[PDB]
């Protein structure tokens, strides 16, 4: 079974927004981009819009699709789509994550993050308007 | 709920674009689509598209930029299509799988029998091809 996930890139003077995965639903303590599973019936955009609302409290406008990749966490097959999020109402707050943080993107290189992101960190940096090395 | 990730490519020839007529017995029969297919276990979208284009077109293709993602449910079976721009390949495509192959003016899509999943986003497609609507 494939699990299509959508997730977003939010931005603050070059910084980027990540959330600390909470301790009970686990890839615990790992830093990710906000987003989640697409529900039966919805489009990718609708799903991100919604996930961003329910996770950050923000009312977002979903921008360009930047990236897609696959990963296996065992038998569990996930497909992430990453979207640029230029525009929203309100400021985000930790409705789901342990912490929210605006970090320099460079810092991702030494932050505990999903192997699905770790494996494409270069592709990510590019999609953000930065070079890998 | 349940999902089938598909990868499909945009190949172009002096402005025209390449579609295949779905075979009569493996069916959404008679319908014109962009070549591609289902992603297998362990492969990246790119890997799957390179492979599909080989086994369907006979071409060794280089998979370029990701242009579109969309969802469609054909009743119970849930589909996620990623569309990639295919700029570079070795050889000329031949109908290894499809009933027929054709390079059409993209405008013609408006009056070709195409998957409802593509018809719903024809707007978004024209943009990804660099055209108007
Ligand atoms: N949100 C998010 N998920 C990621 C990322 N990288 C990999 N994933 C995986 O995508 C899957 C689905 O994301 P979730 O946030 O758990 O889905 P959700 O609907 O938002 O929340 P729950 O299903 O209740 O856990 C998880 O297994 C994540 O580990 C990422 O950068 N952001
Ligand atoms: N290839 C392709 N599939 C599309 C398109 N639009 C919707 N689809 C659906 O995507 C699904 C999978 O594509 P297929 O090409 O049939 O899968 P395949 O691996 O290439 O070949 P099969 O195993 O025989 O199905 C089908 O159910 C199509 O209905 C399109 O533009 N191109
Ligand atoms: Mg969620
Ligand atoms: Mg989430
Ligand atoms: Mg959810
Ligand atoms: Mg095929
Ligand atoms: Mg096919
Ligand atoms: Mg196939």
From TrEMBL, chain A:
Give the binding site residues for GTP 1.
21, 25, 33, 37, 117
Residues given in the record as GTP 2 binding sites: 21, 33, 35, 37, 117
Q: Which PROSITE patterns match?
A: NUDIX, NUDIX_BOX
| Reactions it catalyzes | 8-oxo-GTP + H2O = 8-oxo-GMP + diphosphate + H(+); 8-oxo-dGTP + H2O = 8-oxo-dGMP + diphosphate + H(+)
User: What keywords tag this UniProt record?
Assistant: DNA damage, DNA repair, DNA replication, GTP-binding, Hydrolase, Magnesium, Metal-binding, Mutator protein, Nucleotide-binding
Family of this protein: Belongs to the Nudix hydrolase family.
Q: What is this protein called?
A: 8-oxo-dGTP diphosphatase
Species assigned in the record: Bdellovibrio bacteriovorus (strain ATCC 15356 / DSM 50701 / NCIMB 9529 / HD100)
């Amino acid at each position: 079974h494939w699990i299509p996930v959508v997730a977003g890139f939010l931005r603050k003077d070059g910084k980027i927004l990540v959330g600390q995965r909470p301790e009970n639903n686990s890839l615990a303590g790992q830093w990710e981009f906000p987003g989640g599973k697409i529900e039966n019936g919805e489009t990718p955009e609708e799903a991100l819009a919604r996930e961003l609302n329910e996770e950050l409290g923000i009312e977002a406008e979903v921008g360009e699709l930047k990236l897609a990749c696959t990963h296996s966490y065992g038998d569990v097959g996930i497909l992430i789509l990453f979207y640029e999020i230029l525009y929203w109402k309100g400021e985000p707050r930790a409705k789901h994550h342990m912490m929210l943080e605006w970090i320099h993107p460079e810092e991702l290189k030494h932050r505990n993050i999903p192997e699905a992101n770790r494996k494409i960190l270069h592709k990510i940096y590019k999609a953000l308007g930065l070079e890998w090395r």
